[PDB]
């Protein structure tokens, strides 16, 4: 396999939408590299338009659960949950190629049924919204209010602007 040879170099590719399926695969690969050597860095390449939040949280919690530093590299694009994960990379090791686009926005979802049920779901969506903003603020150095306002709607950025914002540390010139 091609991806297997790359994994041998501790290179993990996250491409496409994030869902439980994609998440179990990434998480599975991260746990693997850890067992092979808990000290050697890992390279998580990200090209994703976003996806399910809890699925993304599983990846993020795993990245910090393991010992190796997980570097993140954005190629193509890192949007919404993708940008989130990219910013969750080990400090100093969050990268992006020169022509990548980074986007951040608030959660999107749906709710159906009785008023009571919709209310519960709405509150949980907001909890996830506050949860991600807090983390986005933490990873970028920006304030909660600043993140909350900037992500109210799609917030597109170039690699250089994402860097100047605090989402990544360097752009491979």
């Amino acid at each position: 396999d091609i991806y297997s040879r790359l994994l041998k170099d501790r290179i993990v590719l996250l491409s496409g939408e994030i869902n439980d399926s994609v998440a179990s695969s990434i998480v599975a690969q991260l746990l693997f590299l850890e067992a092979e050597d808990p000290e050697k860095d890992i390279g998580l390449y990200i090209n994703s338009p976003g996806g399910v939040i809890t699925s993304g949280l599983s990846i993020y919690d795993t990245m910090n659960f393991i010992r190796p530093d997980v570097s993140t590299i954005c190629i193509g694009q890192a949007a919404a949950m993708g940008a989130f994960l990219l910013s969750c990379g080990a400090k100093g090791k969050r990268f992006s190629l020169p022509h990548s686009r980074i986007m951040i926005h608030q959660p999107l979802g749906g709710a159906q049924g009785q008023a009571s049920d919709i209310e519960i779901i709405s509150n949980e969506i907001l909890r996830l919204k506050g949860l991600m903003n807090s983390i986005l603020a933490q990873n970028s150095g920006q304030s909660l209010e600043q993140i909350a306002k900037d992500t109210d709607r799609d917030f597109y950025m170039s690699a250089k602007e994402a860097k100047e914002y605090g989402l990544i540390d360097k752009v491979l010139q």
Binding site: G50, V52, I53, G56, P107
Partner: peptide
């Protein structure tokens, strides 16, 4: 499910 909730998504971003």
């Amino acid at each position: 499910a909730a998504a971003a």
